Write a protein that binds this ligand. Structure first.
Ligand SMILES: Nc1ncnc2c1ncn2[C@@H]1O[C@H](COP(=O)(O)OP(=O)(O)OP(O)(O)=S)[C@@H](O)[C@H]1O
Ligand SMILES: Nc1ncnc2c1ncn2[C@@H]1O[C@H](COP(=O)(O)OP(=O)(O)OP(O)(O)=S)[C@@H](O)[C@H]1O
Ligand SMILES: Nc1ncnc2c1ncn2[C@@H]1O[C@H](COP(=O)(O)OP(=O)(O)OP(O)(O)=S)[C@@H](O)[C@H]1O
Ligand SMILES: Nc1ncnc2c1ncn2[C@@H]1O[C@H](COP(=O)(O)OP(=O)(O)OP(O)(O)=S)[C@@H](O)[C@H]1O
Ligand SMILES: [Mg+2]
Ligand SMILES: [Mg+2]
Ligand SMILES: [Mg+2]
Ligand SMILES: [Tl+]
Ligand SMILES: [Tl+]
Ligand SMILES: [Tl+]
Ligand SMILES: [Tl+]
Ligand SMILES: [Tl+]
Ligand SMILES: [Tl+]
Ligand SMILES: [Tl+]
Ligand SMILES: [Tl+]
Ligand SMILES: [Tl+]
Ligand SMILES: [Tl+]
Lengths: 524, 131, 524, 524
């Protein structure tokens, strides 16, 4: 394929032009005084949304070079979403502000490599300063406050989260599903969650969630690489027979077997989902049997004389609902004998006693805590069907914000956290003049999130940002009420984790983009 | 520098001297915020003129490189002959800093600028030679 | 007239583009390793020259905005020429380097007004540092050294200047004219020089000199404004009768009378030249009669009952050769009675005795010193006619360099003087960051003259400039011999005055050009 | 006027393209196997000629930059013509060969300033080597041989020159004019020749000669600058009265008076010719009176009380034919008393006795030798009128070749002289590699004249040049007979002076053109 190549200044202006499209399309949806962005669909009515992720996903430009620019900062927005679930718009407004001001310096004639190091040092210092500004959420009374304001002043939501975290702990696994009737239910059932994701993004049948979901799914377990579908056929033959979904957990799934299940699932023949095995090496073979007795299947490793062709429903593990994120898989409520579950739990609690090394102790402890600890389930109770929808959609987000509120804490919202960090790093310097500007680029970028919220509120951003900088602490601007005051007291707050992610990721890409000299793309 | 100095002194005797830096007009602006007309359309006509009085100051600040919105907002918060010195980038009493405009010149500048704008706003038809 | 108007960034890039044409056309002729620039003429053969002034004068661009840019920096080159006579190319290479690097900062987003002040402060400090680096020429033995190397290692030239300055002094008036025979002659004749120039540039009949010259010219003196030519007619009627040139010294010459003499002189009817009266106010009326008895005319002020209509050859002042520069007029060897010359000299030496004020003492002393002191004449002796030409052309320049060598001194040549100043002002700072860059712009501009000479020599400018900066003092690069060493010892030197003029003027224009936001010109 | 400016490589290729037109149009007319070049005229029939000067003069290109190139090398051809009268085509073929090969090196990335110095050193060495190869013409028997072969094997021509040079000497003045009858006449008449030319080229009324000619002209003598024509009018009034031509000898003629005589002469009113005075300074005033008593006029210097308005035919000098070249004026046979001619001759032969200095002795000796020595006249005798023409046209050239044969001598023709020098300078080196190529460029350029003659002869130049280089001495190629042999023995020879001029001038321009970086011309 013939290629087009652009160099230097010519190449960069195409990126800036490209990112400016994606940014300006997303930055308008910042804050509560945000604007609507309308996205066209071929089938019927257009989608009107404020969700910065949905808007970002849709952007793809005509000019191949511009497209690249846009598609580069898009990779950050989606990754900020992967880290926290919040702050995708806040990431993008930051990224733009670092890039626009960064490239200005490069065009002025400054060393990009020194500019990157200036930014990253300013960021590493900002993350460090941010931890100091963070107000932790320890007790289950302050945990209830975060879940309440995140779900639009709903006290019933915050009460459920606090009760759920009081059962499984702060590290425990909490999941939300559809309710049975009129009251909110809370049970702790035998389940497990591990750190693997979907082996292909074409299993996402809940597009809004961006995840996979299978009701009463049969589960397969084998330690080996599934490449040919010949071994899968007899398993798949008996699954559409008594039609129930299927979870594939193996060392991996390669080529032919994998690329078939995708055109298989989308056509409608058999609900499938493929995931890598939990862990690697030694724990790989044990966490499989950890899943096994959690589910009630069998490990079919190609050792004793066991194959995937002679593997029936009888040899498979059953659970009553599984979810698979990009990098998160969770098996809720499996079968297996409870006495043989504690019989496997005490088979590994016995290992810690013989554990001559302190590392085994570390990785034998992680198993049981999520195996005999379990998984919580919040069954959402509402009267009408349309009310059952929204209450689920405002618990899921509220749980995500509360999760981040425990791990790193909560800082002052309204984009004041960053603008407060900005004034506290004014004395920060690099090694040479070029590095010094790199820092000042990053600090003036931290003002942009606040400035953008004020712009949507109709007020002059310059005036408001200047007033926030004059006062000290958690003093900021409420865009909803057009009133100044203490942000924490007004319930305006952002989880520290989301603001840390938003800044770090936005700097990471800007750093790569500032050091760009050559671009190679396909010919129009 | 005597010819100009005589012209400024002449106006300083006839009508006097107001606070310079375009603060005189911006001070008048805050003092006429309660002024109303006869109908809604007249009411906007006043608010147009009052927001126009901010522009001279805002323009000086723009040339000074500082953000005009920030400076004008600070001058409005304080009262009296408190303004912005663009030469020194310092705030303070304008009279004490020697920054002053003859009242006559500021009166002329406003009246004339309004007179033409008034005629131009009421324009519906234009007749000129063919290119 | 319909006008075209451009603003901001759009307006500036047209200036830069414009100055870059004039600069690149002139900077190639820098140093002794300089290149030839060929200038076309409508009549016959093209002119091949290295003279940076002749090249600058010819540049005029098509794009009206570009033309403006070019014509702006041209105004400096010519003015540097007016101050010293040397360093016009060195001015232009500096101006470019300040503008190019200056505009870069403006486009980066820095305050032009702070950038100007940064440059000017750096310059005022550089002129101050330059005076310290200067090696004065006091005794008439070191004065002979400067006149020798400036006239291409000719010892006969330097000997004449030293003898001329030993007669009239360092402040005295020295003039060169054509020789009578085979030996160089030197007489001190009764003459005077004052600070006025030609009232119109259309009298320049020696285009190479850029000045006016009249052989055995009749001279007119009247204190009043000559506007109508009616009063001039009877004077002009009797001048073409016995055809000899005419010098007009009056309060001024306005409109009708002036604009006639110009189309009068160029057609060929009557050799004229018009100049304002010497001084202003009181001394105006006395310095006229100071000229009068220096020349042998009469002051025809409209007081007692004297008119310009009844003013014959008899009422006019005679001298045997006058020269008029842009801002310099000199009457060489007039008539008048010698006893009535000292009779007028002692009429004003008597005033100093009665001088109750110390200011009179100042302005009564300036008269006599140039009135009874006189004007020197160097008659250039050669064998052949073509040798008489060049010896005159290499004394005139040698006198101009020696003049500047006395007034301010001589610094180290090869553009090292400026590059030495650059390293000594590295600690200089302004008031804000924008001013700080303004200084660094000016300091990196001081490197350009040297760098340009090295570029013409074929060697890499970066390598040579880096070597000169490492060593200290008057250590520099000889482009003629491709050897390093002490510049003073190698005879490579520049009069301090010319380097001061070259820097100051180049900064003055760059300062004005950096603060440009709007350009208004005629429509194409 | 708006200007167009081109730089570097772009600028040079336009010169090369330009010179290649002029060169290729001239190089075709080299040698005796030369081709005809046809030149168009607006009036009637076109001119068919082989004269390299006539062809060069006509070339003027459309592309302003190309025109410049062409017009630059044209300036050399005409100047070679001014030095010798021969070798204008040989100059141009050389110039091209240095430029084409020179620019090749510059484009390869070599220092033009080092390339120039390489060429000039190679040339200064070639002129030095050429003097050694020269065979002098001392005795009047070998002088007759040169005049014979230059006039197409005519022995009557060579006999006259030898007899003329035996009368006035080798330094003496020899002139040719129209004959009276059937036999060649030779008289020595009282005349003089001095080193000044026509003050304007618009007096040339013999376009083929490129000179001025006046029959029985009245002559004016005055020491001063003639600027106004008012003083000339009464002289011109009495000249058309008894219509005879007029010679103006003065210090000079400036502006109004000069520019009138030009439109005066071409219209047909009064035959005029203007020339500067002989010598400068002191001898200026004496050589005028040297002309005076040679002519029978008067010196009208503005001293005793003498003007140009009261100057009749009576006050004017008469001679019976004058010629004025570009840089040569000669007064043939004047009036004046013969006893007062020797009375002026012995007035200056008396000075040498009192001459306390040895310089006076030098410049008092030059006067008399050409004053009492005189001027020779060869009256060309033929039967028919058309034969009188050609015999004059083949004596004039034959005299020019013989003149150069005495001053510097004669080298081997056929362009072998240069190609012989080329092999003898093969060991010549410069200071650096770039200078070394500069020499090899010049040496390979010396081969071109021969190579061009062979090209016109139809034979392969490479083969012939290779054969000439193998043999040694005055062994060359005869293009007329297509035979090899001794050039001197075959009568093929070039005056050393013409070959020296052809090389030096061609190198001088190429040197200037190689060091060209910027070109400035008028906009199309
Ligand atoms: N009343 C308010 N006044 C000022 N800022 C507010 C207010 N309410 C919320 N915010 C700020 O709104 C910012 C979040 O904007 P959002 O519109 O949620 O964009 P985002 O979080 O980057 O991405 P999405 O669209 O949620 S996926 C947070 O940083 C809050 O600080
Ligand atoms: N140091 C300063 N700081 C702020 N404003 C100033 C300062 N000095 C002068 N001014 C203001 O400058 C304004 C005048 O601007 P000018 O440039 O004089 O324009 P103008 O008077 O409208 O017209 P011209 O150009 O004088 S004919 C006055 O109203 C002063 O108040
Ligand atoms: N041998 C040399 N090596 C290095 N620099 C030299 C040498 N000789 C002279 N210079 C420098 O040449 C510079 C002057 O360049 P010039 O060609 O004279 O240009 P200019 O003086 O700016 O203007 P013109 O063309 O004279 S009107 C001086 O500053 C000298 O320091
Ligand atoms: N028979 C011959 N064989 C070879 N070369 C010859 C012969 N006759 C003459 N030449 C050469 O012809 C060369 C001169 O060529 P010309 O045609 O005279 O051009 P030019 O002298 O450069 O300019 P013009 O045209 O005379 S003004 C001389 O150098 C001779 O050496
Ligand atoms: Mg959000
Ligand atoms: Mg110079
Ligand atoms: Mg010839
Ligand atoms: Tl949003
Ligand atoms: Tl199942
Ligand atoms: Tl608002
Ligand atoms: Tl500023
Ligand atoms: Tl120069
Ligand atoms: Tl006179
Ligand atoms: Tl070199
Ligand atoms: Tl020829
Ligand atoms: Tl005559
Ligand atoms: Tl042939």
């Amino acid at each position: 394929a013939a290629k087009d190549v652009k160099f230097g200044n010519d190449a960069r202006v195409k990126m800036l032009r490209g990112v400016n499209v994606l940014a300006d399309a997303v930055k308008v949806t910042l804050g509560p005084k945000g604007r609507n962005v309308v996205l066209d669909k071929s089938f019927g009515a257009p989608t009107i949304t404020k969700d910065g992720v949905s808007v970002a996903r849709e952007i793809e430009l005509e000019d191949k070079f511009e497209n690249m620019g846009a598609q580069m900062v898009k990779e950050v927005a989606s990754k900020a979403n992967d880290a926290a679930g919040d702050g995708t718009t806040t990431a993008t407004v930051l990224a733009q502000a670092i890039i626009t001001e960064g490239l200005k310096a490069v065009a002025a004639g400054m060393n990009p490599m020194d500019l990157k190091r200036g930014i990253d040092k300013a960021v590493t210092a900002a993350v460090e300063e941010l931890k100091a500004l963070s107000v932790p959420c320890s007790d289950s009374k302050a945990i209830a406050q975060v879940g309440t304001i995140s779900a639009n002043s709903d006290e019933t939501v915050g009460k459920l989260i606090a009760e759920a975290m009081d059962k499984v702990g702060k590290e425990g696994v909490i999941t939300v599903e559809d309710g049975t009737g009129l009251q909110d239910e809370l049970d702790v059932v035998e389940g497990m969650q591990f750190d693997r994701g979907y082996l292909s993004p074409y299993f996402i049948n809940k597009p809004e969630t961006g995840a996979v979901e299978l009701e009463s799914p049969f589960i397969l377990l084998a330690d080996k690489k599934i490449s040919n579908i010949r071994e899968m056929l007899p398993v798949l033959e008996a699954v559409a027979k008594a039609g129930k979904p299927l979870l594939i957990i193996a060392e991996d799934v390669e080529g032919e077997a994998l690329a078939t299940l995708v055109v298989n699932t989308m056509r409608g023949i058999v609900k499938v989902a493929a995931v890598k095995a939990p862990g690697f090496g030694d724990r790989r073979k044990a966490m499989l049997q950890d899943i096994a007795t959690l589910t009630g299947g069998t490990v079919i490793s190609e050792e004793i004389g066991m194959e995937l062709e002679k593997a029936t429903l009888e040899d498979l593990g059953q659970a009553k609902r599984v979810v698979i994120n990009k990098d998160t898989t969770t098996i809720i409520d499996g079968v297996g004998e409870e006495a043989a579950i504690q019989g496997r739990v005490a088979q590994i609690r016995q290992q810690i006693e013989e554990a001559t090394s302190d590392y085994d102790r570390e990785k034998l402890q992680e198993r049981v805590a999520k195996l005999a600890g379990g998984v919580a389930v919040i069954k959402v109770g509402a009267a009408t069907e349309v009310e059952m929808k929204e209450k689920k959609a405002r618990v899921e987000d509220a749980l995500h914000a509360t999760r981040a509120a425990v791990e790193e804490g909560v800082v002052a919202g309204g984009g004041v956290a960053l603008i407060r960090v900005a004034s506290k790093l004014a004395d920060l310097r690099g090694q040479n003049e070029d590095q010094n500007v790199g820092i000042k680029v990053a600090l003036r970028a931290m003002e942009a999130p606040l400035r953008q919220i004020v712009l949507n509120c109709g007020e002059e951003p310059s005036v408001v940002a200047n007033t926030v900088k004059g006062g000290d602490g958690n003093y900021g601007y409420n865009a909803a009420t057009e009133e100044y005051g203490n942000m924490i007291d007004m319930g305006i707050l952002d989880p520290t984790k989301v603001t840390r992610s938003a800044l770090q990721y936005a700097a990471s890409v800007a750093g790569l983009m500032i050091t760009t000299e050559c671009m190679v793309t396909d010919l129009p």
